[PDB]
Structures are given as C-alpha cells and as structure tokens.
Design a protein around this ligand. Sequence first.
Ligand SMILES: [Zn+2]
Lengths: 50, 86, 249, 112
Amino acid sequence: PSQKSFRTKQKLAKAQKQNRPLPQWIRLRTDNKIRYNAKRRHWRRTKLGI
Amino acid sequence: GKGTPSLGKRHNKSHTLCNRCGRRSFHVQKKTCSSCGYPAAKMRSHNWALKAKRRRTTGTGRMAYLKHVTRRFKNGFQTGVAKAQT
Amino acid sequence: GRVIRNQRKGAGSIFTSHTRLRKGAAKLRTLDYAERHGYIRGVVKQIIHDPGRGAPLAKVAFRDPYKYKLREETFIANEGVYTGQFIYAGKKASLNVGNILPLGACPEGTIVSNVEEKVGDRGALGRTSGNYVIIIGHNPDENKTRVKLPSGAKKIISSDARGVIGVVAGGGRIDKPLLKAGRAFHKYKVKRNSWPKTRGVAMNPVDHPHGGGNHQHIGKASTISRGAVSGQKAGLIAARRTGLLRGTQ
Amino acid sequence: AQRVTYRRRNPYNTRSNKIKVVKTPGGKLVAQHVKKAASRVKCGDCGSALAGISTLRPRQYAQVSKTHKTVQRAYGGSRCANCVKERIVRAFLIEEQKIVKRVLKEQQDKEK
RNA sequence: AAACUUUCAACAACGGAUCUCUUGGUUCUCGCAUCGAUGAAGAACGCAGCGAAAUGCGAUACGUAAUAUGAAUUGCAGAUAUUCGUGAAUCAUCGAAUCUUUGAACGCACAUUGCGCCCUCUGGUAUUCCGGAGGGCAUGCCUGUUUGAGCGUCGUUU
RNA sequence: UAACGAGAUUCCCACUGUCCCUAUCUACUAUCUAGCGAAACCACAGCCAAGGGAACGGGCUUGGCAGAAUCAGCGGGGAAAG
RNA sequence: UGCUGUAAAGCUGGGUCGAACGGCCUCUAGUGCAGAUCUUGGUGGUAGUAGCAAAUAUUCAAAUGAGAACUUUGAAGACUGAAGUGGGGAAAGGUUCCAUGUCAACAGCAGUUGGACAUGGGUUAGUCGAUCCUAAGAGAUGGGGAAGCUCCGUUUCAACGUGCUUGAUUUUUCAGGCCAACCAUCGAAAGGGAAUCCGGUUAAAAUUCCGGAACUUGGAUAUGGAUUCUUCACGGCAACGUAACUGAAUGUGGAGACGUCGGCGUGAGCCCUGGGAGGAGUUAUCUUUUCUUCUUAACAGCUUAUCACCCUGGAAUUGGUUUAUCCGGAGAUGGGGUCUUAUGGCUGGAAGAGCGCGGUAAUUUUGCCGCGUCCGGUGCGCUUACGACGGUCCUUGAAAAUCCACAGGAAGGAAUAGUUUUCAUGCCAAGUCGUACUCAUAACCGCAGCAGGUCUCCAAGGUUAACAGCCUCUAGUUGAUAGAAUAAUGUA
RNA sequence: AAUAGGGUGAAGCCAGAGGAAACUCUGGUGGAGGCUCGUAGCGGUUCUGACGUGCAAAUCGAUCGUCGAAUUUGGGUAUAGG
RNA sequence: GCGAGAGACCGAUAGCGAACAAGUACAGUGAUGGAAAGAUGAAAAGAACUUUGAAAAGAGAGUGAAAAAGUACGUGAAAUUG
Ligand SMILES: [Zn+2]
C-alpha cells in the first residue's frame, strides 16, 4: 500500500533491479551458457510473498 | 461458501519477515518465527526434518570466516608478516 | 469422549470475568490504629453504579493519618446512605446506618452488612443487594460473636471483625421478571460468558454424560457422588435429596 | 453539485475525522478537517460549568493568557461562585461552633 | 472411375529413443583435528567502465596490504597502465587490514531503519537547547578494589 | 392456549394454459460462415433374428441380408461414462 | 538384399552416419516386458467438433498503417443515472504510474492498441501519518517450578532512582533539600494526540514543490509596556472584567473522557428563486426566454447565544412556560446585568487571487490591455454539525500520556533603583521513515484480464412517502469475438 | 463504523363532560416496543428454475426471511488437536 | 569437516533431489514441499552480398570435411502425419 515500512520498500527496490533482461554482451563471452534471464518475474503472475 | 467466496477474504498476513532468517515466517501475534525459532537463542532444528537442515546450514551461505580456518591451521596459526627473500 | 463444558471453564480463556467497566473492588478500609482505638470520619462523595453488581457503590473520602493526602474507599452502599453523609469507622463509632463498627461493639439483633470473616479481610459476608447479617449473640470471654448469614447458616466470628450497619441497597431486584432473552443477554454481557446454556441431554455422547439416545433422556441417575471426578460431575452433585421441596427444612 | 473527498489517509467517519465542506476562493467545494470540540471547565464541588473561563482543548491552555483560564476570587478557576460562598460560610460557622463546644467544656469540667 | 479408408516403401515432418561420450554422483581406503563475545554459522542490503543470476567481496565493497611469480586481461572499451622491471595478471600464496545492517547479538526496543543516557572534541552568541564526529552503557558468574548495610557481633567511653 | 410461523395437513372463495388441448409470438442459442479451438472416453470395432454359450452376443453357428462419402436431430442399444 | 537356425537369434546387400567395437574360453550381475486403474515422456482418434450466447448498442467518416469490426479524432446514437460504470481512500499488490519505441509470445477473434514487451523518467513535509499514550492483552526482571526445551508470576515473601531540585563551585570539587504510593517493555496508519491554509505548477508529485498568508513546540534573549517608596495591579454590590499584574515542596480539582433513541431549534453546504452586469442556445410561430459566471481559505481583531449565574423585589384571583409540564418563599413573573463563542456578522487576509467577457500579440518561450466580478429572498426541503431537552436499562455505556487551574506559603525580592519571557515585538531550530498508481465485471484473493469475495467517505433535477423504481444533468464508459439467416429442441 | 421511508400508537401531560363520592367517559398531546410494512444490509425458502467437462471445486435468476437490535461488520486480541 | 587415492560402481527417466545461475524456479499462512533442464563444429569460419516480401521468412550465394551439422544444432527410432 502507500503506507509501507522502510524494510518493505527496501525489498521492493531489490525486486525491481533483479527484473531486467540479460545484457547482450554477456552472450558473446567465451564458454558462455546463459541465453536469457530465467528468473524474470511479472507482477501479475507470481507474487513476491513479502 | 467455504471455497471461492471464502478465499476472497485473505488480506491479513499471519506471518511477516523474520529478522534472523528473513523468510516471512515470523508470526506476528505469537512474536515467534516458525522457521528458525526467533527470538529464542537457539535455532529451530529437528532430526525428523533432515531436508530442512540442508536448506539452512553451514556452507549454504558465505562461510566468510570459516573459509580460511583450514588455511590458517595449515600454517600453524602464524603471527607476523612474510619476509622478503634475499 | 471430549472435554465437556464444565472443564473448559477452569482454563479461563473465554470464561474470565468482563471487568472493563467495573468501578473497583468494594472493600472496607485497611484496619489501622484509628479504627482500632477510636474512630475516623469520612464523607460520601459519590453513589455509583457498578456494572455486573446489583448493589450501588459509595465512594467515601477519608484523611490519611500519617501523610497529607486524601484516601478514597469503595464501599457497598447501605440503603439510606446519601451523598455528603459522614461515615464513622472505628471502635468508638456510634450505631448509625452506614457506620463501620466491630461486631463486638454491636448489640444483639443489629443488622449489619459487608461483614468480615477474618480480622482485616475487608469484608466478606452479606454483600449482595438486599442482604444482611443478623448478630445473633455474643460470647465475650473468647471474644466471639454468633451471626446469621443470608442463607440461614449460623457462624462464629471474632468480635474484632467489622461490619457496616444497615442493609445493602438495591434490594428487591429479583422481584421483576426479565421477560426477554435480550435482558439476560445484557445482564451477562457485563459479568462473564455463561449464557445461554445448552442442555446436556440435547448433546451427543462426546459432549456430555447426558447426551445421545433415540430419545432425549438422562439414562442413569442424575445424582452424582461427591467423590466423582471432573467430567462426571454433571447434574446434581452430592444431592442429599431431590424433588419438589415439601414442608420445612 | 460538487462532491468532496477526505484530505487525509483516514477514510472512516471517526470522531477525529470529522469534516466541514467549505467553498474556497477558487470556486471549489472542498472538505475542511474539523478539530474536536472542546469541553467546558467544570466545578470541582458541584460539577457545573465555571464562568469566565475559555473553552479550549487541553493543550491549548498552555499558550493562552492567564486571565482566560481563571477568575479573580478564591478558588477562581476551580470552584464556582456559589461553591466558594458555601465553603466560606461553613468554615466560619463550624469553627465558631468549635469555640462554643469548647468553652462549654471548661464550664462542664470544673463543676462536676 | 475418382474421392475416401486401410496397408506398405521412398522422401519430408513430429518426437527425442538408441549409440557414443562425461569438469557429476556413489562406494571403499588413507591422513588430519581446525567454529564463536578478539563476535561465529546464518540472513538482509549493497559493490564492477558497460551485469540480471551464479561466483567474489563490504562504503578500502568482483576487492586493499604483504610474499611469490614474471607479461598479461579479453565480449567490447580504456588509461593521468605496464615490459632486461619494486613489474601486467594471479582467491598463486597469504601472516597485515577493511568488514554496511544484522544475527549467540550486548544501552532500551524492534511488524519502527523508534527512543535514550555518559565522556571528549566541534558548529550554532551555550554546563542546561539544537546539530555533528569519535568513544561508550547487556546478563549470569569468578578473583580483586572501593563505597557501604545489619544491636550479627568484638574491645573502649559514658 | 391468544399472538406469531419461508413448519405439516384438509376444505372454501378468488384466480388462473396445472389441465381438456394445444396454438402463436419475441430475444439469446442451436444452424451456416471467418477466426480461435478443447475434454470425457477409446482391446478391436460398430446391421438384425434364432441357437448354443458364464443360462440377455458386435464378433461364434445357421439364416436375413449387404453399395462410396455424408448433414441436422434423437435418445432404443453400446448390460454407454462418472 | 538375402542366407542360417524348430526357435531364442546370428550373419549379410543397399542407404544413413562419424569413433569406437566385436568373435572365442572363462568370470560376474541392478541381465530379456504387452499388460501391474504400472512410472516418466511423447503422440492420436474424438475434431476443425463442443463451443467462444449474462451485464440494452452501436453506426458513418477521416487519419495512421503493409494490413483497421476492434487504434486515434470528429459526428451521431446510447447507457451507468449521485446506495453510479463518478471522485477518493484502508487492507492487499509492487512500478502495474508517465513518455518514447514496439508486436515474437500474451490480451481463448483480431490488433497499428495494452496493466504485454524494451528503454528511460518519476514519489520533496516542523504542521499529513507513523513516531508517543494507554485498551483487551503480550511479556523480561527479582523469585519459585521443571531432567530439560522452558513454565508461572508482572511488583510478585526484592536492599529495585542509569532520581530530581536549587545555590553553585570552577575549588570541574560540592553544599545540601525533597522524594521514590504507582512505575521494565511491547500493544491502535479507525481510540487519545502540539501546530497549514489558499492560488499556481508536471508527461507523471504535491495539505510536501512555487507565490503569498499563518500557526505550534523547543531554546536563546533584548527592548517597550506592566509593577514596586502601602513591595508582589486595579475595577465591579455582585455574577465577573482587563495587555501584564511573585509563588517551591506538597495537595485538591478540571480537561483528555465517552451508550443509544426521539422530536425540536440554530448554523453550514447544497437545492430553489428575484433584480442587474456578461456569454452561449432556440426563434415558421411563441417565449422580458432556456443554460451558464457573479467566488472568498487557514488565520487576526471587534462583536455575536441557548443554557447558566448575579443584583433588585416579594408572588393564590397562583404565575411563567415547552411540539413534548416542568419551574418558583431553597425566591417565580417583572426590571437590570455577567458568562461560555459553538455558530453567525463586519473588517483585515483580499482581489493583487480565481472566474466571466472583450480587444489585440505571434513560428513566438509565453502573453499584454480593458471591463465586470453586485444586491437580495425562501423553506415540515436534503445532508450534516452543534444545542437545549426528553425516553431507556437486573444494560448506566475505556484508559493513559498530556495540559491547565486552584489550595499552600518555601524562597526571593525596590527608591534612585529593583522583577517578568502566562503582555507586545524581535532571534534561532524543528531530525528519521512513508508519500507514484490500482482499490477492482483487468492492478487484491479465488491456478486466470474468473458474473464469486473484499471495510469506508462525498451524493444534482423531475415524479414520489421514499436515499425505492423510472427519465435526465456533472463525471465516466460505449468494454463483453463478429457476419448471414431465423428449422426442430431448448433458456428467458 | 453502519442501519431509506411509512403504519400502529404504551406510559406521562392538557382540556372538556358526567358523579354524593369512589370514580367514569370524550377529544387532543406524547412517541414506547427483542412491534409491524418495507429499501440498503444480513440470510438463503421455493422453483426441487438455469448451470452442472459451469462465470463459479456452490455461482446466476426470480421468489423469499429479517430489517433498531440476542442487529451487521472492520481492525486488535485470546483460546490449538483427544 | 579438511585433504588425498581408488573401484569387475552409474552413465543424463541412471547416479546425490541437484553433471546445467539446484535446495534453484515454483507452491503453501506456515511447519514444509520441490522440479525440468548435458552434447553444432577442429575453429563461429554463426551465413557477407543479390533478390521477393510490411516483416518473419524464402530463393540464390557464401563458410565448412560435412548445412543429410544453421544455435527449433551429434546420431535422429516408434507412436503420429504429409
Ligand atoms: Zn526466522
């Protein structure tokens, strides 16, 4: 809600920063196996459970 | 009306985040963590839950200080500094 | 079976008394030098309603003998007590309604209320509305007084025990029917969670010794031994007799 | 007609969330939040409202002048005029009677 | 007769068997004895020139010092970076440090980034108010120091 | 036993498609098209009669018969499914 | 492609393929599948089938675009119809917010659109909350149980102050003087509580930013006023008044602080309406017409009241008086006064703002000028606040922090000088965390963009008893796969 | 914290009429009640309606019960598997 | 736990649940529950360029020992399908 705690807001800040696609230059590294970010999260699909 | 109609009244959390283990298992009214037993001095752990020990135990985190005990032991717990070779 | 409704009350989870609106414990003054050797005078400031209690309470202000202070006491208001009345408490107090006197200082036939069983327990006997204790007699050489209790029992108390002269106010309360489940609901809303009561014979055998059967009936004798155990004492416990009371007892 | 909204996060009609509807210089019908009404100072003997004393919420008495909070008389801002008059007459009469009950005693304690 | 249905072969699909691998597991053997109030295990949150995770680290933050070594790093870029040299890279080694908020977690409290108090320095015209920096204030118990309490009790003076 | 009753029951008046005995009308379906597109169920399959048979056969024996591909309905059977 | 063997199987021709593999003598085993409503994975028929039918309803054009039933804009037709499909919030969510770009997947048709995807941007507080208080309760300590994890207890069989107040002292020592009933702590974003309003402003923030106008608390502190030679003010018969106008320990009291119903009264907002000053609509005919703007915040001063109280006077022929019958020798009616300022009026705030018109500027960032912004009325109206009353109960309808007054009389105080920050004015500061958006027939929970569920505030006209139903205004939507037909059987 | 609009008309009170009195009668006023009709709300009677591989692991429609208190409800809090 | 060496052990539905960013994703109020997922090539040499298309793509071409190796990547079975 609008009225939240600092501890709650600090968790929501981290949840957004982790929710980005894979930067592309990492696909170009030698011996690279990661094709995409497999830990994406949509707000309507899976809840954070905070 | 115990199915879908009753499932619509779930907006009061029984549990919040625990300060010691950060798991969302701190019971608000009981003021206890159902996971680690906080605020008891001992961690909650049972021999009937062996998989639960796997999830949270030594080596599942950083081991930031125990990492180097073997390295310091192997050198007899030295004191001082290394010398420059002549 | 299951733990029956008798045994759930001892835990006192939802069976504690509702005490938010109660105006304090009604006690006499702590017995002290002034009451033991002379008398002390106070004034009735308020006569208030205590929820859950049929008797009104009187707030009485006394002076502190040893420090500059006013002490408020909560008495059970004897009928005929009014605001601003002077209340005298002690060995030398006169025999007037509302005064607090030791039992030995009262003549036989004196009507007294809020009487102490023990010297200094601050009142035990005859505290409900319309009730009183009659001083039957004195046995002075062992310092004892025989009194008649509201139930008819005769008791022997130390003459140093104190009591308030007169009858407890609010009497006659039972003379009017309640007429309504709502009235009883409001009555016990400020006392405790003991209403309404389901008949045990209307339950299942898990819930009560009286439950079960293809007809509602007790089945075995409803008179229970005094030596029975918890979970069995449902019915008439240690009854010396049953049935309609015919004649004198 | 213009309709109004609460100006604070409290959405309930509680005793501390009472609002007045006020027309502003902008031609807007807004809600104005209203502080709780103050109660009158009352006499300590009879419980009636004392005259000449301001009606303020308890904390407001701290930053108001003294003549607003009192009356120039014995027990000024505390007891009403009649209650002070009753105490004075009672105090004088009773203490005069204490003299009479005493001088009578030395009349009684030297003849028997 | 076509179409349709069914069967078969070729080719193409669907699908991921089979085959061959394998920085993983599993078992057995050998050796060793090393967590923490000098703050552990765990958690949370952060940190890279361009990073989400994993790995590493703690505002000195994919690391600092030291020792050894001896030209890299690399997906791209770029030095106020380096090459017969106190010199690239290196968890190679590691004995000196840093180590946020926590956590046995310790000023009190904690569903709050809440509330104190003490010492030194410092800003605001300030021993008292406000701000800042640094250092502190848990509990049980032990040894000792100091200040005490008790007609518990000893000697003296009335 | 007055009052009360989404309690059970009988009768009377009113009322009526409940019925004699059905008919007509409207919207949304179903129908057809474009797009989208499941599930239950599935030994193999799918025409009858009689016989015998685990005594009520789709298949066996003996007869009747029997002509591609199908659409809308329907609820006799599949001793239909759950 | 064949051959061999009764068979289990073995060998071979051709094709594909790219790194290991076989025969024979022995050893060894997690060693041979058609089934177990077997396990895991995959794929069918059914089958282009069932179906995609609640919530009145869409149509024309233009633009964009490869492409438009579905995007945007305009025109229209509609609906929700103020107990809303409106405007906000609490819980819950967590970036869904806003702009730019974009259509692989998702939006059970489509898609140029989107709560999707990608890249950025965005949440400003002394005054709003939290923070503080206590409630039901929770729960350390001293203790007492229990093998123990821990259990009881909450001031308890306790030597329980990390006390204060001054005079200080600078000698960084002290001198003391009063306490210690109760009191760890936690427990409310709806209870209690210090203090902020208006106008403007963004793509997205605002009681937070900008402009202006205030207020509170804490601290420092000077000037003026007030006061003193009758040391700690005067006036009024009084209710009490005032710019101020000593007061420690301790004590007493008040506020905080309180149910519900009924009718009545007052105010406020809205509704209704008259004149006038403007603008828009209708005008075949009628209509001095229909619609619309004419507003005034917190705060400051002065005044303003039911109830209550005071002085005078002494009342049956009893009087006064409410919608509601209560009051008076315990002093009525009458006459004269005092008080609370709830609520209104005036003035300041403040017309400089906002609003409505007119006239010009111009790529223009943004405007500039002028004029007006006035005076009323009405009520069993609606909602709401307050007031004075009345009823009701075997029901009598929180606490604490906090603040004030009073009692008391400690101590200190002038005369050529003294006191006080409860009078005015002036100075400084006000930390931390939250703040975007949804709040639901798509942002929450029901596996989902599910006809379910989920607390509350504001509330126009007509009809009407009515906040019902029905029609309409402001605001908001026009979302629910469509097209052609109209058999049977259905559902309404 | 929430709960339209009406009906009925209890005590109390005013006035009038009758009576030797005890008392009676009439008209008003008043506005009581776990009273009544009936919205929101809360519930869930009947159609044994729809649906029943649903919008839905209990809903939809009409009909219905109650609707000022033994009322409804948010948050906090307590009670935990014989 | 630390550090080593081995095996008539398993060989990606096996072997630890985990050969992979595995106690991960995800579910549940919570205690807890808990997967799937290895292989182009020697080397990305990962298809320049032309053409049709709005684009995705296609047809040529090119790289390569091989494109009967194109990241939907070794081989590529059966069901099922053209
Ligand atoms: Zn925990």
